[PDB]
Amino acid sequence: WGAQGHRLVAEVADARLNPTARAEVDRLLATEPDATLASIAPWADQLRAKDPGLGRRSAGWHYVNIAEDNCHYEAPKHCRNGNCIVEALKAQSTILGDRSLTDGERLQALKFVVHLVGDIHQPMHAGYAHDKGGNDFQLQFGNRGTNLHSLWDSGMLNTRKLDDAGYLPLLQSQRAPKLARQSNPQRDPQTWAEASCRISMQAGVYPATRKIGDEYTERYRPLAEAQLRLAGENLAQLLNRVLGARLE
Ligand SMILES: Nc1ccn([C@@H]2O[C@H](COP(=O)(O)O)[C@@H](O)[C@H]2O)c(=O)n1
Ligand code: NA
Ligand SMILES: [Zn+2]
Ligand SMILES: [Zn+2]
Ligand SMILES: [Zn+2]
């Protein structure tokens, strides 16, 4: 997602946190003055842009290209050295839940988790290696060029012309998505990447024309918005499991 998609996923999640998870998130955020779950949500993309070390090393953590294998993820094939969103979200979830670590180390893991639960719900972040998740699939949207990746990250969301205050209650107004009964931090990332990949491969998502506009938006913007709500709900479920109560 673009910055607004990331923040919306965090805003949807923030409202669903159980009291134990809410208190812990607020403790980790407090280590960084003025940080909120929304404000950190785009941080991992800024790190990629600005940091020629960890930013360059983390770039592959934002996606996993499995559509050529019909959305059947295999870690040794698609995620050599753990450099993809499935393995990165798993490890950062483990790190976030490690209470022996400093609040500073856990806040950094929270920044990655908030971001990656967002990206792993953007269909094009689980799409084709051939066109780099749509980045190399150029098209005309209205009268100006974009690419199919950008169109799903932000192009269609931008057509609402809402700030977060306007967009958040629209996502909350949607029918409740189907979640797993329970969070499994080690297994859900693959399940989510595969589900996102299956949307990238749905009839029409790749259009049969170079030029698209309001017809594409009216059919697919609802699916992009369903994925934001689903990401936000999945992110709260994950935070509630990893940062929730530890009795016994
Ligand atoms: N041409 C581009 C494409 C993306 N980007 C950045 O990448 C972000 C999206 O990264 P993800 O694909 O990881 O969602 C955008 O919010 C923007 O900051 C950019 O700065 N220039
Ligand atoms: Na609601
Ligand atoms: Zn994103
Ligand atoms: Zn993207
Ligand atoms: Zn990203």
Coordinates of N, CA and C in Angstrom, one line a residue, residues 4 156-163 167 221:
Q4 N -1.3 6.0 3.0 CA -2.6 6.0 3.5 C -3.1 4.6 3.8
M156 N -6.4 3.5 -6.8 CA -7.8 3.3 -6.7 C -8.3 3.9 -5.4
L157 N -7.5 3.8 -4.3 CA -7.9 4.4 -3.0 C -8.0 5.9 -3.1
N158 N -7.1 6.5 -3.9 CA -7.0 8.0 -4.1 C -8.3 8.5 -4.7
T159 N -9.0 7.7 -5.5 CA -10.3 8.1 -6.2 C -11.3 8.5 -5.1
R160 N -11.3 8.0 -3.9 CA -12.3 8.4 -2.8 C -12.0 9.8 -2.4
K161 N -10.8 10.3 -2.5 CA -10.3 11.7 -2.2 C -10.7 12.0 -0.7
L162 N -10.5 10.9 0.1 CA -10.7 11.0 1.6 C -9.4 11.1 2.3
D163 N -9.3 11.9 3.4 CA -8.2 11.7 4.3 C -8.6 10.5 5.2
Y167 N -11.9 8.0 5.4 CA -11.8 6.6 4.9 C -12.0 5.6 6.0
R221 N -11.9 -1.4 -6.8 CA -11.7 -0.5 -5.6 C -12.4 -1.2 -4.4

